[PDB]
Amino acid sequence: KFNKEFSVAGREIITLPNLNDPQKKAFLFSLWDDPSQSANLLAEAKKLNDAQAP
Amino acid sequence: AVDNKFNKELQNAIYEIFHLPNLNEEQRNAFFQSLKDDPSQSANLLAEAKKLNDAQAPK
Numbered sequence: 001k002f003n004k005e006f007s008v009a010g011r012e013i014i015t016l017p018n019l020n021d022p023q024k025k026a027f028l029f030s031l032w033d034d035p036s037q038s039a040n041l042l043a044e045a046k047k048l049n050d051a052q053a054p
Numbered sequence: 055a056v057d058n059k060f061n062k063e064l065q066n067a068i069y070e071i072f073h074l075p076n077l078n079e080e081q082r083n084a085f086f087q088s089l090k091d092d093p094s095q096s097a098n099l100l101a102e103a104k105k106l107n108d109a110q111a112p113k
Contacts, residue, residue, distance in 0.1 A: 002083035002090075010072055025069040032068050032086060033058060 001035045009038040013045050018052040056093075064093045067100040074103055076110040 013019075013027045027045045031038060058064055071077070071085050085103050089096060 002086040004079070006083065006086075007079055014072070021069075025065055028068055028072060029059075029065045032090070 002032075005038065006031065006035045009035070009042055012042050016045055016049040018049045018054070019045065023048065058093055061093060061096070063096045064089060067096040067103075070100060071103045074107040076107045076112065077103065081106060 009031055010028055013031065014024050016024070019027075023045075027041055031041055067089060068086065071082060074082070077085075081103075085099050088099050
């Protein structure tokens with residue numbers, strides 16, 4: 001399940017500018033644990049990123 | 055027994071491997087699969103990844 005789509009989703013997580021390292025690590029773990037949840041996880045991470053906007 | 059969600063060593067290894075600058079995508083993904091196959095190998099696989107990263111330095 002670790003293919004090109006996985007790489008894209010992981011990059012999307014780590015480039016969210018307002019998440020901190022523990023948060024990105026946690027999202028990346030969740031993606032690794034279930035790559036089929038990428039859409040839900042990416043939407044969750046973006047929502048949290050926006051909640052943390054300066 | 056350490057469950058994956060409760061395993062900081064596995065989670066840190068995934069995060070560090072994803073950041074390594076000199077691996078290719080195939081290497082990264084192979085490490086992620088090897089971690090899935092046996093999370094007790096996190097320390098060994100992270101060390102192997104850093105070794106390959108350093109061997110593959112562009113200068």
